[PDB]
């Protein structure tokens, strides 16, 4: 039997997705405030709040915990339905992935503030945690790929192409970038296998591809399932799906050196990164086109359905960032952009605008269904959430652009006499209003997250036994 879809894990992951979203974004707001007012840092005593330590916590919680859980819930729901079979690992393998993932985030929460970090971005957790994550991910791929193997229909939905790719590539990236000799039990009590330029390359190959697969590909899978899930029928382009997918999947791995522009990294590598990052523009947009064009005719729905609003706007930000990224990947542009708040602007445009928004919409869609509910408790709240999230994202982006341009310019600016026009401190001071506005925008987005939490909770209350009949 077991004809019914295993909703179990998806339910757990969805709720946790909301929870981690709140935790991660709140850390985001707090650290932002710390940039605005350093007092928020403990003056005497490292303690609980210190920016250097908290920052990676924000990073990991937001990406792996929030984004990660979103990916788990979405992939488990989506693959099951798209292929029409009950999850291959079942409660056992899949639930293991749930608890295991939970353990991973919990360990991050304890470990990071404690000070144990490799110092490698998006890599920060210590080796023991790395082994745990590798194990959980291995289990996760078996469940997912197994689900595909067990499918009913002969064809495999493109959404699964993206999810599947994301799964495999992240595993490879994680293993490779994490090679390190353990000196001690924890924290970064390991030293990376590589050093210098090589370490930088491995790091950014890993680092970009992280957003590339974890944040883009996997989420593209989400978009592929959820955007078309609507009352309106067909409008899409399958051939684009094919071109866009392969081209993206191939091209994206080359993008690593754009991080490294005008650094110690050899010129040839930097160039390869730039060129491929520019080629990357097309496939990435292919995703957005495929998503948006699908809406055509359907647009009237946008006023009606806020979940749709979220998905659509999500693609808008996605395209924007996928455009801005290639531009910043040009050496001349990077010359200005690098080390400035602009990089952050770019990150949150994609993070809040693309990743968060699509996952949000995804959850609003799925959680009622998984919960054995016709719909969310209040649509109005989804709308309010939509607005809060949108203004917050835009405010964040605007502030960062102003700050970033100001910083790059101020840093580079030379006088008539040839001397440096501004002290670094002057640039720092210039940045303050930007820091505050950013703090506010992020705060608003966070509030939207709270509204989501309230709404979801209300809906969650309704029924025990929410097997949703056959499905």
């Amino acid at each position: 039997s077991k004809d019914e879809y295993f909703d179990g894990v998806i339910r757990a992951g969805v709720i946790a997705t909301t929870f981690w979203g709140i935790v991660g974004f709140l850390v985001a707001v707090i650290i932002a405030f710390q940039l605005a007012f350093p007092a928020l840092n403990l003056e005497f005593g490292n303690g609980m709040l210190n920016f250097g330590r908290l920052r990676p916590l924000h990073t990991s919680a937001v990406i792996f915990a929030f984004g990660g859980n979103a990916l788990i819930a979405s992939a488990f729901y989506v693959v099951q339905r798209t292929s029409a079979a009950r999850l291959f690992g079942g409660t056992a393998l899949g639930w293991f992935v749930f608890w295991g993932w939970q353990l991973i985030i919990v360990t991050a929460a304890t470990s990071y503030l404690l000070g144990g970090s490799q110092g490698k971005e998006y890599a920060e957790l210590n080796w023991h945690l790395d082994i745990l994550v590798a194990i959980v991910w291995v289990a996760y791929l078996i469940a997912f790929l197994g689900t595909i193997f067990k499918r009913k229909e002969p064809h495999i939905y493109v959404a699964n192409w993206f999810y599947l790719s994301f799964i495999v590539t992240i595993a490879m990236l994680h293993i490779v970038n994490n090679l390190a000799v353990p000196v001690s039990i924890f924290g970064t009590k390991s030293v990376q296998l590589m050093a210098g330029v090589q370490d930088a390359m491995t790091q950014w190959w890993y680092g970009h591809n992280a957003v590339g697969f974890f944040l883009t590909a996997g989420f593209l899978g989400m978009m592929y399932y959820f955007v078309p899930k609507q009352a309106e029928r067909p409008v899409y382009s399958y051939k684009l799906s094919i071109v866009h997918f392969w081209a993206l999947i191939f091209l994206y791995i080359w993008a690593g050196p754009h991080h490294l522009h005008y650094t110690a990294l050899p010129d040839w590598a930097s160039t390869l990164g730039m060129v491929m990052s520019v080629i990357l523009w097309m496939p990435s947009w292919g995703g957005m086109i495929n998503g948006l064009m699908t809406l055509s005719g359907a647009w009237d729905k946008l006023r009606t359905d806020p979940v749709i609003r979220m998905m659509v706007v999500s693609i808008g930000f996605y395209g924007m960032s996928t455009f801005e990224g290639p531009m910043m990947s040009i050496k001349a542009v990077n010359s200005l952009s690098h080390y400035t708040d602009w990089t952050i602007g770019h990150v949150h445009s994609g993070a809040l605008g693309w990743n968060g928004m699509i996952t949000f919409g995804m959850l609003y869609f799925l959680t009622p269904r998984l919960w054995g509910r016709s719909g969310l408790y209040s649509l109005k709240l989804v709308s309010w959430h939509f607005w809060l999230a949108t203004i917050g994202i835009v405010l964040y982006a605007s502030s960062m652009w102003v700050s970033g341009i100001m910083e790059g310019l101020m840093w580079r600016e030379v006088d008539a006499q040839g001397f440096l026009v501004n002290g670094f401190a002057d640039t720092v001071g210039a940045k303050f209003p930007m820091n505050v506005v950013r703090g506010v925008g992020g705060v608003l987005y966070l509030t939207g997250g709270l509204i989501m939490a309230y709404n979801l909770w209300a809906t969650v209350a309704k029924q025990p036994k929410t097997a949703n009949l056959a499905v």
Binding site: W299, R303, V312, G316, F323, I330, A332, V333
Partner: peptide
């Protein structure tokens, strides 16, 4: 809806502008 389309076009224009300015430089 039309506001989202307007914002999207605005972003695209900002982008083309950045390209021009970088070629300036």
């Amino acid at each position: 809806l039309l506001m989202f389309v307007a914002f999207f076009g605005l972003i695209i224009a900002v982008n083309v502008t950045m390209a021009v300015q970088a070629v300036k430089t």
